[PDB]
Design a protein around this ligand. Sequence first.
Ligand SMILES: O=c1ccn([C@@H]2O[C@H](COP(=O)(O)OP(=O)(O)O)[C@@H](O)[C@H]2O)c(=O)[nH]1
Ligand SMILES: [Mn+2]
Length: 291
Amino acid sequence: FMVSLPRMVYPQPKVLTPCRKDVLVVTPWLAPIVWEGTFNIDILNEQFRLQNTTIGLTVFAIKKYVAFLKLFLETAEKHFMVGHRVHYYVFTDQPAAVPRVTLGTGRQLSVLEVRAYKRWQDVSMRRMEMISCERRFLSEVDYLVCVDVDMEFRDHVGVEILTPLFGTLHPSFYGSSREAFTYERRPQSQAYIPKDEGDFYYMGAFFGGSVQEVQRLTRACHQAMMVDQANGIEAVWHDESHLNKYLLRHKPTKVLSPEYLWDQQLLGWPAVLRKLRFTAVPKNHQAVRNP
Ligand SMILES: O=c1ccn([C@@H]2O[C@H](COP(=O)(O)OP(=O)(O)O)[C@@H](O)[C@H]2O)c(=O)[nH]1
Ligand SMILES: [Mn+2]
């Protein structure tokens, strides 16, 4: 049950004036695409606080990637769901390497020890299994948000994202035609998507939803990866390939714009982005992924 909103004073929405004319703000299945200017955060904050919403954030920090945790968590404290209840779940092979980060009130962090796979591809892919293995979520949080650790928050990431199921537009492909998307194209793979199918190319580094929907997604992707492995095939973009297949066949209820997953070093700061919210931390891929 949801109580009434209180009286609020804010600018009247104008029916004959779009919030944004330069971008698509709703998908063909009527899911909002979240861009700056499309939401009044005061209204959304009210709605979600009135439900005493708790948000879980999963992040994996395996082997050398523990180095990314300090900046990740400190900037999350500044920008992620501030004012709401937050539970971080840090999955790592090195619990003693997790930095002691000071948390705001109503925010907690749990360290979950997991095994380290040798191949970075396996470390990345096994996140689906490890997220799905975990039964605490249903009792502890309302929503789960699942992100990469090699990142920092630079601006607001809040309850505007919350919805039963969301994916995020990959920053390299939001302007691309579907034939150019790097979906898995081999029919032998469970992740296969033909050249005439696809809505968007979603980023493996940021998806989420209700606990129920996230556990469905991660279970489905894990089982699809198991089938591929039995068939001696590994999808071209690993977990991201399976995520893309899942979100093609199970449409997300919101889609996040590339504000929510950007790489400024690689892609700069185009006119279409009013904010860069959650951004890549420069990596030496080969060095950091291997002993
Ligand atoms: O040795 C590794 C390799 C990967 N990861 C995790 O898997 C995610 C995805 O890998 P990565 O960020 O290297 O992929 P990219 O964004 O470069 O495609 C990372 O953010 C980490 O959360 C990790 O913890 N240790
Ligand atoms: Mn990453």
